[PDB]
Design an enzyme around this catalytic site. Sequence first.
Site, PDB file in Angstrom:
ATOM      1  N   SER A 209      41.745   4.064  -3.190  1.00  0.00           N
ATOM      2  CA  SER A 209      42.731   3.668  -4.201  1.00  0.00           C
ATOM      3  C   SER A 209      43.190   2.210  -3.988  1.00  0.00           C
ATOM      4  O   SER A 209      42.378   1.281  -4.128  1.00  0.00           O
ATOM      5  CB  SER A 209      43.892   4.677  -4.250  1.00  0.00           C
ATOM      6  N   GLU A 341      41.224  11.141 -11.762  1.00  0.00           N
ATOM      7  CA  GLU A 341      42.094  10.170 -11.106  1.00  0.00           C
ATOM      8  C   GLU A 341      43.500  10.058 -11.691  1.00  0.00           C
ATOM      9  O   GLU A 341      44.446   9.811 -10.960  1.00  0.00           O
ATOM     10  CB  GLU A 341      41.476   8.762 -11.180  1.00  0.00           C
ATOM     11  N   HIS A 449      43.249  12.181  -7.512  1.00  0.00           N
ATOM     12  CA  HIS A 449      43.182  11.028  -6.624  1.00  0.00           C
ATOM     13  C   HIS A 449      43.598  11.364  -5.199  1.00  0.00           C
ATOM     14  O   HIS A 449      44.544  12.139  -4.989  1.00  0.00           O
ATOM     15  CB  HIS A 449      44.030   9.881  -7.178  1.00  0.00           C
TER      16      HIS A 449
END
Length: 534
Positions: A209, A341, A449
């Site tokens: 990320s 995500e 995520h």
Amino acid sequence: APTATLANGDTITGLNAIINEAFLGIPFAEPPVGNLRFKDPVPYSGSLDGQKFTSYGPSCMQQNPEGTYEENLPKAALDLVMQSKVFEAVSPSSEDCLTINVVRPPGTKAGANLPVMLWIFGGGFEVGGTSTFPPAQMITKSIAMGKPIIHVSVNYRVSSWGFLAGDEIKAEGSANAGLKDQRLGMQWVADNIAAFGGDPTKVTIFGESAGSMSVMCHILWNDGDNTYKGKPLFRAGIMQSGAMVPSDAVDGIYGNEIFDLLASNAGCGSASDKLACLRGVSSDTLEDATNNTPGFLAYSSLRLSYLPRPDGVNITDDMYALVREGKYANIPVIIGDQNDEGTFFGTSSLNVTTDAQAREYFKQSFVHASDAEIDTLMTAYPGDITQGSPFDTGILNALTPQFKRISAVLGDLGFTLARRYFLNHYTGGTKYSFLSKQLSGLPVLGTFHSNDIVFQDYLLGSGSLIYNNAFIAFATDLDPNTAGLLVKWPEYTSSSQSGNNLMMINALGLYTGKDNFRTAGYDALFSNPPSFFV
Ligand SMILES: *[C@@H]1O[C@H](CO)[C@@H](O[C@@H]2O[C@H](CO)[C@@H](O)[C@H](O)[C@H]2NC(C)=O)[C@H](O)[C@H]1NC(C)=O
Ligand SMILES: *[C@@H]1O[C@H](CO)[C@@H](O)[C@H](O)[C@H]1NC(C)=O
Ligand SMILES: [Ca+2]
Ligand SMILES: [Ca+2]
């Protein structure tokens, strides 16, 4: 006890954890406190001779993810949790936090020349620390594979402390302090890793990320010049969920709004030099002021208050433009995503329920988008609940009529389709890409995520085959296929190529697929990337 003699002659002592040897909490920079706040990190000048490094130091100051200038329960609740003496004890943070950690296979000696995997943590450029990412699983698996690697992780400043922007910061040359912390750690590795048994010429940078986007920024840094003392700082990179950051310049509109707000919050609204005023307030005052600016889980969501921004000096321009123009380091890469995500982040706007409210939220979030562009986005990402994220879940997960839709946009622009844009323009080296659907069926979130962190550092699952094995083979031979997996990982050339170009993961294992989904969204988003910048 594990021992290493640094470049400057200092001999330090580590910890023998049986399954690995670790040197935790080595300072690599002078404490960025007082008048050093928001400024570039200064190399650590000091003696570590005779010292032991057996514990992770504190993380840098953390921002309340639910922070915001508004007052609400989520904010109040997290603050209660974060300011608790128990939390304070299990997870210490401080402005003096610039430390680096080296963990290696038992019995590793200087001169071993093992490949090095340098970890950069995620956390929305607002939270995060190296202690929550145990390297044991990676290391153990590397030994069993006969491809031992040395694991390195570096702390960096997050939130206001590391990504403050605006006119003043720009004028001073203090933009992207947190990325500069990461860069210094890389230089420390180039200078000192041989002493621990690692090879400075075999460094692979990787992160998830915010950390993945950091890796991208490192590829684009100094217009692609990644050398230090005549040698490149890394030979490859692995990007787990995140490519270019869609952000305006450091002295842009939002960078300036946040700076002024923080300044008002700290009591510096009337200072002629707000920057010097901010350097003088106490840590508590600054921490408070920061928690009163939006956190990544607040309504503003991914329109982050603090994140990397082009400064015209180290990141010379719009990051999408740098990629089209060839201003990057030429290295082989692996870049992938989790199928869903945006779902976790989509929970930040659950009070948006009608299309009229959705259009307004999008307008508010993308200040540069014209109404036509907004209409195009809402045609490419329709109200139809069967079309949103969690993908392929039909009528399920309809928290609101707009949730799955908002989640689809957040995930695509912030990560998934951004990756495709990079892949279609990057000619720097060989490219490999993956897409995980390992958690298909998980209610509300899907393959969300950060789940990859669990299967890379904590639990073993089909995903570990990629997150550990393949990544280790890439760091060692620059080809994930040396891991000896049953499914061959094909090279990615373009999204329009014939044949499968994506390595895929489901609960049972691996298979290949194509990166040809949501082409309409890609065009809506990337016809003119700057229209959706923050
Ligand atoms: C959903 O909640 C948000 C957050 O509370 C609302 O936005 C805030 O609205 C207040 C009152 O108008 C403003 O003072 C704040 O500045 C807003 N915060 C942000 C970050 O914009 C929002 O209006 C609500 N959305 C809907 C569709 O009802
Ligand atoms: C930032 O850019 C300037 C100008 O090229 C350069 O001198 C400086 O060393 C860069 N900083 C880092 C950490 O690379
Ligand atoms: Ca201003
Ligand atoms: Ca070039």
